[PDB]
Amino acid sequence: GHHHHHHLEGGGNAQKSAMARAKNLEKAKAAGKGSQLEANKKAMSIQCKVCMQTFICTTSEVKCREHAEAKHPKADVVACFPHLKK
């Protein structure tokens, strides 16, 4: 031994993994957050106006721009990103 017992066992993930197999695989989150069959949204798509959250870039801003001028009801559902309204 000269730093730790082993280096990459392959897998495991258990309560007793916290130090022994910490470098093996912890991932980060035990499940995730969402995004299944979805596209890559780790690109930092759209931040929500309410604070700092995010929404999927299924629309850029220019395409919502045309939709905005043509609509702009009251934002509401798009109040989270008012480029989709006027």
Radius of gyration of the chain (CA): 22
Q: How far apart are CA 23 and CA 27, in angstroms?
A: 10
Q: How far apart are CA 20 and CA 25, in angstroms?
A: 11
Chain centre to alpha carbon of residue 62 = 23
Q: Give me the domain span that covers residue 82.
A: 1-86
Q: How far apart are CA 84 and CA 56, in angstroms?
A: 13
Is the CB of residue 72 less than 8 Å from the CB of residue 82?
Answer: no
Q: Which residues pair with 55 in a beta bridge?
A: 46
Q: How far apart are CA 39 and CA 29, in angstroms?
A: 19
Q: Which residues pair with 47 in a beta bridge?
A: 54
- Strands in 1-86 per DSSP E: 46-47, 54-55
Question: Domain total for the chain?
Answer: 1
Q: How far apart are CA 82 and CA 59, in angstroms?
A: 13
- Strands in 4-84 per DSSP E: 46-47, 54-55
Q: How far apart are CA 15 and CA 30, in angstroms?
A: 12
The CATH number given to whatever domain includes residue 73 is 4.10.1050.10
